[PDB]
Amino acid sequence: YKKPKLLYCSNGGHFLRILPDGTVDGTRDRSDQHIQLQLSAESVGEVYIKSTETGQYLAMDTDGLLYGSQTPNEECLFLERLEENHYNTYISKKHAEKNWFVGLKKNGSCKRGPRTHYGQKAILFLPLPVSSD
Amino acid sequence: YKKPKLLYCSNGGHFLRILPDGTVDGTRDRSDQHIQLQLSAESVGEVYIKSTETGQYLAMDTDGLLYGSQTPNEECLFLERLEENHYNTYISKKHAEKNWFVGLKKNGSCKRGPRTHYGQKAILFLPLPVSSD
Amino acid sequence: MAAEPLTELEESIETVVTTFFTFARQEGRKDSLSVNEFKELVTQQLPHLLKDVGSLDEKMKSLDVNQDSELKFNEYWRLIGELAKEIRKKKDLXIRKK
Amino acid sequence: MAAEPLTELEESIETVVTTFFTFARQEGRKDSLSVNEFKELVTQQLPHLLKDVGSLDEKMKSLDVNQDSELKFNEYWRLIGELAKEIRKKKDLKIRXX
Numbered sequence: 001y002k003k004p005k006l007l008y009c010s011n012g013g014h015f016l017r018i019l020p021d022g023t024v025d026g027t028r029d030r031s032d033q034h035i036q037l038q039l040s041a042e043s044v045g046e047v048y049i050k051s052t053e054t055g056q057y058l059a060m061d062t063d064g065l066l067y068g069s070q071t072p073n074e075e076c077l078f079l080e081r082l083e084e085n086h087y088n089t090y091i092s093k094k095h096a097e098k099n100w101f102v103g104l105k106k107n108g109s110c111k112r113g114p115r116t117h118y119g120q121k122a123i124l125f126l127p128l129p130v131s132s133d
Numbered sequence: 134y135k136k137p138k139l140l141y142c143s144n145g146g147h148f149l150r151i152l153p154d155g156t157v158d159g160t161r162d163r164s165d166q167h168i169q170l171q172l173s174a175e176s177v178g179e180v181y182i183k184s185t186e187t188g189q190y191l192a193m194d195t196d197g198l199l200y201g202s203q204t205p206n207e208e209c210l211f212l213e214r215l216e217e218n219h220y221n222t223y224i225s226k227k228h229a230e231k232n233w234f235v236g237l238k239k240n241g242s243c244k245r246g247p248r249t250h251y252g253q254k255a256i257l258f259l260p261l262p263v264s265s266d
Numbered sequence: 267m268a269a270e271p272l273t274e275l276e277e278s279i280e281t282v283v284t285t286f287f288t289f290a291r292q293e294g295r296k297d298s299l300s301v302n303e304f305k306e307l308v309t310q311q312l313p314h315l316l317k318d319v320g321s322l323d324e325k326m327k328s329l330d331v332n333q334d335s336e337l338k339f340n341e342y343w344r345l346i347g348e349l350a351k352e353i354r355k356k357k358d359l360x361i362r363k364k
Numbered sequence: 365m366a367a368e369p370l371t372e373l374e375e376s377i378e379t380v381v382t383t384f385f386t387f388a389r390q391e392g393r394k395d396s397l398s399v400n401e402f403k404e405l406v407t408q409q410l411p412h413l414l415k416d417v418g419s420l421d422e423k424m425k426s427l428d429v430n431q432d433s434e435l436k437f438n439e440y441w442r443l444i445g446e447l448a449k450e451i452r453k454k455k456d457l458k459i460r461x462x
Contacts, residue, residue, distance in 0.1 A: 099291060114306070119288030232394075250389035252382075275383070275409065278376045279451065285372055315373065340449060347445070350377050351438070 004036030004054065005129035009087070009122045010106030018055030022069035026106050039129060047080040047090060048072065063095035066102060066110035078102055087124030092116075137169030137187065138262035142220070142255045143239030151188030155202035159239045172262060180213040180223060181205065196228035197246030199237060211235055220257030225249070282346065285311060299337035301326065315349050380444060383409070388440075396434040399424065405443075413450050 008015045008026060015035040017027030027035060037051040037058075049058045050072055058068030060075035068076065078090035078101070091101040095113070103123045104110035112120055141148045141159060148168040150160030160168060170184040170191075182191045183205055191201030193208035201209065211223035211234070224234040228246065236256040237243035245253060272280065289311075290296050292303040299307070304326065309319045318325070325348075327333070329341050351359075369375070388394050390401045397405065403420045414423070427442045428435055435442075454461050 114292065115288055117288040117291055119284050232389075247390055248386070251394050252386035252389040273412075275380065276451070278379045279448065281372050282376050311371065311373070315371070339452060343448060346373065349373055351441075353374075353377065354437075 001130045001132060002040070003130050004033070005039035005127065006030075006036055007039060007049075007088070007125050007127045007129070008106070009104060009125040012106060014106045016104070016110070018051040018068070020056050020069060022056065022067050023109070024055070024066075024068065025109050026104065039127070041080055042077070045079050046077050046093065048076055049078070049090075050076070060092060060094065060102070060113070061111075062113065063092050063098070063100040063102070063116065064111070064113035066104060066113070083124050085124055086126065088127050089123060090125070134263045134265060135173070136263050137166070138172035138260065139163075139169055140172060140182075140221070140258050140260045140262070141239070142237060142258040145239060147239045149237070149243070151184040151201070153189050153202060155189065155200050156242070157188070157199075157201065158242045159237070172260070174213055175210070178212050179210050179226065181209055182211070182223075183209070193225060193227065193235070193246070194244075195246065196225050196231070196233040196235070196249060197244070199235060199243030199246070216257050218257055219259065221260050222256060223258070286342070295336070297339055299342045301335065301337075304337055304342075312345075312349065315352065384437075384440065388437075393434070395437050397440050398435075399433055402435055402440070410447075413447055413454075 006015055013028040014026035015028060015030065016024060016037070017029070017032075017035045018024040018037060019034060029035070033054055036054045037049050038053065039047060039049055042048045049068070051057070051068070056069040057072035058066070058076040059071060059073040060066050060068075063075070075092070075094045077094055078092050079096070081089035081091055081101075083089050089101065092113075100113050100116045101123055102110070103112040103116040103120050104125075105112055105122060112122065116123060139148055146161040147159035148161060148163065149157055149170070150162070150165075150168045151157040151170060152167060162168070166187055169187045170182050171186065172180060172182055175181045182201070184190070184201070189202040190205035191199070191209040192204060192206040193199050193201075196208070208225070208227045210227055211225050212229070214222035214224055214234075216222050222234065225246075233246055233249040234256055235243070236245040236249040236253050237258075238245055239255060245255065249256060269280070285307075286299075287296060289307050290299045290303050292306075293300045305319075305322050308316055308322050308325075313319060325345070326337065329337055329344055331341070332338070370378075385394065387401055387405050388397055390404065391398050402424060406414055406420060406423070407417050411417070416423070423443070423446075424435075425431065428439055430439075
């Protein structure tokens with residue numbers, strides 16, 4: 001039942017609540033339909049994050065800062081990777097050259113590109129999407 | 134109801150189980166009557182540890198090593214002190230000169246004289262005696 | 267390259283190195299601090315401990331001393347030292363010595 | 365609520381400072397390590413870094429510049445540098461390293 005794909009990171013009740021405005025935060029609520037994105041593998045390993053039926057399309061600001069609203073620029077193309085820690089990893093191929101892979105702040109928002117390496121664990125997102133099992 | 138005075142230290146189920154032999158260990162049990170000593174203030178501030186109705190009298194080995202069985206030598210005289218951390222402190226006046234105050238190893242036994250100064254927290258014992266309230 | 271198994275105290279020296287490592291791999295070269303890696307580090311991780319984020323340049327000059335301007339893998343380390351003593355040592359270093 | 369976590373740099377100086385303190389108070393004065401006191405650090409919690417558990421005299425002389433036979437806090441602290449160096453350095457000349 002491919003639908004609202006919920007994604008978040010860092011132990012603790014906090015979900016990625018996207019808003020048409022662009023300022024997406026880690027809202028810890030599931031009452032208002034604003035914490036769901038249409039995550040899917042567009043190309044071989046290339047997954048896109050688009051909150052179609054709820055918000056807007058993502059468009060990272062040079063990886064450094066994560067945002068979305070206007071258009072799903074290539075910045076929004078990430079390589080789907082999995083870690084043996086019950087978490088999902090997405091490499092922003094657009095900036096993979098600098099070893100940068102999408103990282104958000106559970107209690108801040110998605111914008112930690114200059115710190116997206118083997119230090120900030122927030123990169124290991126925990127997905128709760130309605131798969132087709 | 135002055136009776137079996139239970140005393141132990143270091144967070145974790147472990148009680149001072151005294152044996153006539155002398156080898157007292159931090160047994161975490163309350164089924165066998167062997168973890169009770171007759172702790173009381175003999176002199177002004179001087180408290181003694183004697184497991185009369187259960188084991189034997191204590192007799193520290195130059196503070197360094199804590200033991201008891203044969204006789205309650207002066208080594209067993211300690212100054213009753215209290216710390217604002219919900220724990221009791223006993224200074225082995227017999228060796229206070231070296232700033233040494235009775236310290237036991239929750240998972241080892243009572244014998245840390247060379248380490249009975251401000252460094253090991255095990256010196257902060259938690260008493261559970263049947264007071265007369 | 268990097269670390270299999272270590273010890274208890276080796277973890278706590280790692281955790282700070284891991285901070286170092288995710289800040290120095292910024293412009294060039296993760297093995298050396300660069301000066302929009304260093305200043306970003308002092309301004310973010312050391313804004314309270316090091317109450318001199320505006321005079322980094324002096325610290326840098328004092329640190330670097332080969333003056334290649336790669337804050338090297340023990341030039342840099344000194345900084346953690348200066349914070350380490352700072353907690354004890356408000357200002358009271360002086361020294362002057364060739 | 366209480367027991368608030370500080371920065372990684374405050375964490376790591378504390379963990380070594382407490383360990384230091386659990387050895388400094390062994391004998392006279394709970395700040396200075398005397399000779400035995402000092403040797404007890406290496407012989408117990410340092411079997412790999414400085415595997416030299418026999419020539420502690422050399423370290424002592426190299427550390428205690430004034431040769432008072434007290435490594436005061438800051439004098440003792442020198443060792444931590446040689447440690448923090450060794451973990452990177454160790455024998456970057458022959459071995460290798462790892």
